[PDB]
Design an enzyme around this catalytic site. Structure first.
Site, PDB file in Angstrom:
ATOM      1  N   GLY A 164       0.734  -1.251   0.000  1.00 32.00           N
ATOM      2  CA  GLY A 164       0.000   0.000   0.000  1.00 32.00           C
ATOM      3  C   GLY A 164       0.773   1.318   0.000  1.00 32.00           C
ATOM      4  N   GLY A 216       2.246   2.626  -2.462  1.00 36.09           N
ATOM      5  CA  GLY A 216       2.040   3.228  -3.771  1.00 36.09           C
ATOM      6  C   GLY A 216       2.930   2.706  -4.889  1.00 36.09           C
ATOM      7  N   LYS A 217       3.562   1.550  -4.677  1.00 32.29           N
ATOM      8  CA  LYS A 217       4.465   1.012  -5.704  1.00 32.29           C
ATOM      9  C   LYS A 217       3.849   0.874  -7.108  1.00 32.29           C
ATOM     10  CE  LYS A 217       5.352  -2.680  -3.471  1.00 32.29           C
ATOM     11  NZ  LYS A 217       4.356  -2.220  -2.455  1.00 32.29           N
ATOM     12  N   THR A 218       2.720   0.185  -7.180  1.00 30.32           N
ATOM     13  CA  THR A 218       2.025  -0.054  -8.426  1.00 30.32           C
ATOM     14  C   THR A 218       1.560   1.247  -9.075  1.00 30.32           C
ATOM     15  OG1 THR A 218       1.303  -2.271  -7.707  1.00 30.32           O
ATOM     16  CG2 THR A 218       0.052  -1.243  -9.483  1.00 30.32           C
ATOM     17  N   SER A 219       0.974   2.135  -8.274  1.00 30.42           N
ATOM     18  CA  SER A 219       0.497   3.431  -8.761  1.00 30.42           C
ATOM     19  C   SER A 219       1.653   4.201  -9.402  1.00 30.42           C
ATOM     20  CB  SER A 219      -0.073   4.267  -7.609  1.00 30.42           C
ATOM     21  OG  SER A 219      -1.221   3.658  -7.032  1.00 30.42           O
ATOM     22  N   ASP A 251       2.046  -8.245  -8.273  1.00 26.25           N
ATOM     23  CA  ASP A 251       1.159  -8.451  -7.123  1.00 26.25           C
ATOM     24  C   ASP A 251       0.245  -9.668  -7.221  1.00 26.25           C
ATOM     25  OD1 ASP A 251       0.642  -4.842  -6.412  1.00 26.25           O
ATOM     26  OD2 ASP A 251       2.379  -6.177  -6.128  1.00 26.25           O
ATOM     27  N   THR A 273      -4.632  -2.655  -0.831  1.00 26.30           N
ATOM     28  CA  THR A 273      -3.571  -3.650  -0.638  1.00 26.30           C
ATOM     29  C   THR A 273      -3.553  -4.138   0.802  1.00 26.30           C
ATOM     30  OG1 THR A 273      -2.179  -2.503  -2.286  1.00 26.30           O
ATOM     31  CG2 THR A 273      -1.096  -4.170  -0.886  1.00 26.30           C
TER      32      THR A 273
HETATM   33  N1  LIG Z   1      -0.044   9.974  -3.521  1.00 28.35           N
HETATM   34  C1  LIG Z   1      -1.178   9.203  -3.460  1.00 28.35           C
HETATM   35  N2  LIG Z   1      -2.299   9.909  -3.171  1.00 28.35           N
HETATM   36  C2  LIG Z   1      -3.498   9.330  -3.073  1.00 28.35           C
HETATM   37  N3  LIG Z   1      -3.601   8.001  -3.283  1.00 28.35           N
HETATM   38  C3  LIG Z   1      -2.497   7.270  -3.570  1.00 28.35           C
HETATM   39  C4  LIG Z   1      -1.232   7.751  -3.677  1.00 28.35           C
HETATM   40  N4  LIG Z   1      -0.425   6.648  -3.970  1.00 28.35           N
HETATM   41  C5  LIG Z   1      -1.190   5.619  -4.011  1.00 28.35           C
HETATM   42  N5  LIG Z   1      -2.443   5.919  -3.727  1.00 28.35           N
HETATM   43  C6  LIG Z   1      -3.717   5.077  -3.729  1.00 28.35           C
HETATM   44  O1  LIG Z   1      -3.456   3.952  -2.878  1.00 28.35           O
HETATM   45  C7  LIG Z   1      -3.696   2.511  -3.095  1.00 28.35           C
HETATM   46  C8  LIG Z   1      -2.287   2.239  -2.645  1.00 28.35           C
HETATM   47  O2  LIG Z   1      -1.660   1.458  -3.674  1.00 28.35           O
HETATM   48  P1  LIG Z   1      -0.710   0.801  -4.769  1.00 28.35           P
HETATM   49  O3  LIG Z   1      -0.063   1.871  -5.497  1.00 28.35           O
HETATM   50  O4  LIG Z   1      -1.608  -0.342  -5.178  1.00 28.35           O
HETATM   51  O5  LIG Z   1       0.534   0.491  -3.770  1.00 28.35           O
HETATM   52  P2  LIG Z   1       1.241  -0.898  -3.579  1.00 28.35           P
HETATM   53  O6  LIG Z   1       1.563  -1.416  -4.996  1.00 28.35           O
HETATM   54  O7  LIG Z   1       2.529  -0.395  -2.846  1.00 28.35           O
HETATM   55  O8  LIG Z   1       0.336  -1.762  -2.770  1.00 28.35           O
HETATM   56  C9  LIG Z   1      -4.480   2.636  -4.380  1.00 28.35           C
HETATM   57  O9  LIG Z   1      -5.868   2.463  -4.007  1.00 28.35           O
HETATM   58  C10 LIG Z   1      -4.083   4.104  -4.876  1.00 28.35           C
HETATM   59  O10 LIG Z   1      -4.759   4.565  -6.079  1.00 28.35           O
HETATM   60 MG   LIG Z   2       1.150  -3.235  -5.880  1.00 24.55          MG
END
Ligand SMILES: Nc1ncnc2c1ncn2[C@@H]1O[C@H](COP(=O)(O)OP(=O)(O)O)[C@@H](O)[C@H]1O
Ligand SMILES: [Mg+2]
Ligand SMILES: Nc1ncnc2c1ncn2[C@@H]1O[C@H](COP(=O)(O)OP(=O)(O)O)[C@@H](O)[C@H]1O
Ligand SMILES: [Cl-]
Ligand SMILES: [Cl-]
Ligand SMILES: [Cl-]
Ligand SMILES: [Mg+2]
Length: 540
Positions: A18, A20-23, A45, A456
């Site tokens: 959670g 934000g890796k994937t994002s 994932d 996540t």
């Molecule tokens: N800077 C940010 N601001 C708001 N939401 C974010 C940010 N980075 C990630 N998220 C949101 O958070 C979740 C966190 O996820 P994800 O990127 O799936 O991280 P991970 O791959 O590390 O689990 C998603 O629902 C996403 O769209």
């Molecule tokens: Mg991920």
């Protein structure tokens, strides 16, 4: 962004569930595809949602992402890879060795360690396929291997040693030793690989990331970048006590980063009002410039827990979700209501006694023990292999659980509250050779899963629950910690995030747990009994 500059062909993002890796990976891919680069995005994932963000399906086959010219994607299923890893080793002995034996060997190949080894087998194939760099400018991965997995694969003993243990996975290595060494050289070569450490502006996370940085550098991955995600833009800190207290908390941390990360190129990404579900949303993430649910309070869970005047209460969950804080808050309330409580913790930082055990000393004890037990006759390369296996995350959990076991017997006369527990997998393994029935008895023991109102984190909590279930342990309840929807704020950004939580809190209520509690984000840190008491909320 500094991390976006002159990137080598392989880009890896690491960090907790959670962060934000994937994002960040999707946004990076888009950005590069738009600069005319040919990009391969590798989704790694367990319950990949990458297809979702691009509104299309992706599989274990490279496919172009229609909505983004220049970009293709590939999904490597880790659960599937471990399954096949396991089947390759176990299938040949089914109907050969007796069922209980095969079943034991199978359980040895069902932990997080086997999944990591299997994932690395997958990473290795991609890292060694030279043809890929013929079609793509960059290959981006939304997870990265750990230092532990890498060290295991580089040990001579892994290719010549025969010995609770997680080395069983080694037997399944698909490729030749040379390919893994090659893959490791590719990871350690800054001209080929760049690693991005993703974190949040929270003192706790930063320390974990600092540790990760040292481990990876020690192995040779010295091409590292730090990306701090979800930062609260100062603007929002206007006219609101929480947003101000939070903005203030991150700022301190931002200006006081752990020394080990100080020299790393650092970029910050602002918190977005909506969980990015499209290209525009994703791309907005790289910008350099910027009402409640119906769930009982923690007080409620505690009220029902008090009912039988005694028992074992175990807080479980991924790292950093709040197990120690929740355990503390539970022990305080029970104690405050006349019950005898004994709190045990693995973190150094009346009618309530607290026991603190030092993980390091327990681990080392346990390590010394398994070493004289299984180490004899092993040559030196074999002992180092064994020592590295005793460096798995589960080693510590076993050792600490071992120690907590001294007072777990008091659960009969009072309340014993523990802030950490081993996995169902590890439990099963320990029970193969420990009070299993006690943990399985619904009355005597009440396992609480701590998580966050996020995607996540919720999935990860659910998987931890499925695993405990395999071990005959049914989580008594779930605690959704750090919730905004339950907190009071006028900050539009914050309220917007609070709204993003609804779906997650709903999936926990109607799919993962019977009993659920909601705890608000308290800003700062709940270090004093006062704050700790504030997390619970009131009676009835
Ligand atoms: N800077 C940010 N601001 C708001 N939401 C974010 C940010 N980075 C990630 N998220 C949101 O958070 C979740 C966190 O996820 P994800 O990127 O799936 O991280 P991970 O791959 O590390 O689990 C998603 O629902 C996403 O769209
Ligand atoms: Mg991920
Ligand atoms: N509701 C909350 N509000 C503010 N801070 C919290 C909350 N829950 C946890 N934290 C803070 O978060 C960290 C997360 O930690 P901890 O509870 O130690 O969890 P774990 O034992 O699961 O690693 C500590 O810095 C902590 O005091
Ligand atoms: Cl494991
Ligand atoms: Cl395992
Ligand atoms: Cl392992
Ligand atoms: Mg803890």
């Amino acid at each position: 962004m500094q991390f976006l500059q002159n990137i080598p062909p392989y880009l890896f993002f690491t960090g907790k569930g959670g962060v934000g890796k994937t994002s960040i990976s999707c946004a990076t891919a888009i950005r590069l595809a738009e600069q005319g680069k040919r990009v391969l995005l590798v989704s790694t994932d367990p319950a990949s949602n990458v297809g979702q963000v691009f509104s299309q399906t992706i599989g274990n086959t490279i496919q172009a992402i229609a909505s983004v010219p220049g970009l293709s994607a590939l999904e490597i299923d880790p659960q599937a890879a471990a399954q096949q890893y396991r089947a390759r080793i176990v299938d040949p002995i089914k109907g050969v060795l007796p069922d209980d034996v095969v079943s034991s060997i199978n359980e040895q190949l069902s932990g997080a360690c086997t999944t990591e080894i299997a994932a690395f087998d997958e990473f290795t194939g991609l890292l060694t396929d030279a043809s890929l760099l013929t079609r793509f400018d960059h290959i981006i991965f939304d997870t990265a291997p750990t230092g532990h997995t890498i060290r295991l694969l580089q040990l001579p003993g892994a290719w010549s040693s025969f010995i609770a243990s997680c080395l069983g996975p080694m037997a399944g290595l698909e490729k030749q030793r040379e390919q893994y060494a090659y893959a490791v050289e590719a990871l350690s070569d800054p001209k080929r690989t760049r690693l991005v450490l993703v974190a949040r502006l929270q003192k706790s996370t930063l320390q974990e990331v600092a540790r990760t940085h040292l481990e990876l550098a020690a192995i040779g991955l010295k091409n590292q970048y730090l990306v701090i995600n979800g930062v609260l833009p100062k603007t929002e800190a206007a006219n609101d006590t929480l947003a101000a207290a939070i903005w203030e908390r991150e700022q301190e941390a931002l200006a006081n980063l752990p020394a080990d990360l100080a020299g790393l190129p650092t970029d910050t990404l602002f918190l977005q009002p909506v969980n990015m579900v499209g290209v525009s949303a994703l791309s907005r993430l790289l910008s350099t410039q910027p009402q409640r649910p119906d769930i009982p309070s923690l007080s409620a869970l505690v009220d029902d827990i008090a009912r039988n005047e005694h028992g074992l209460i175990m807080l479980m969950g991924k790292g950093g979700v709040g197990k120690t804080t929740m355990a503390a808050a539970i022990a305080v309330r029970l104690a405050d209501m006349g019950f005898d409580v004994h709190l045990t913790t693995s973190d150094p930082a009346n009618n309530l006694q607290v026991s603190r055990i030092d993980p390091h000393e327990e681990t080392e004890r346990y390590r010394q023990h398994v070493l004289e037990t299984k180490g004899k006759e092993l040559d030196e390369a074999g002992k180092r292999l064994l020592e590295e296996d005793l460096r798995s995350p589960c080693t510590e959990e076993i050792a600490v659980f071992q120690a907590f076991s001294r007072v777990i017997r008091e659960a009969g006369k009072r309340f014993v509250v523990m802030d950490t527990a081993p996995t169902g997998h590890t439990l099963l393994l320990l029970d193969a050779t420990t009070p299993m029935m006690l943990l399985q008895d619904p009355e005597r023991t009440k396992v609480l899963l701590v998580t966050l109102p996020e995607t996540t984190p919720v999935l990860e909590a659910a998987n931890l629950q499925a695993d405990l279930e395999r071990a005959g342990i049914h989580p008594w309840g779930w605690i959704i910690n750090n919730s905004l929807s339950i907190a009071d704020t006028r900050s539009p950004l914050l309220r917007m995030r609070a709204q993003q939580e609804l779906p997650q809190i709903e999936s926990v209520k109607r799919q993962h747990a019977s009993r659920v509690a909601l705890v608000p984000v308290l800003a700062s840190e709940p270090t004093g009994i006062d704050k700790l008491k504030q997390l619970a909320g009131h009676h009835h």
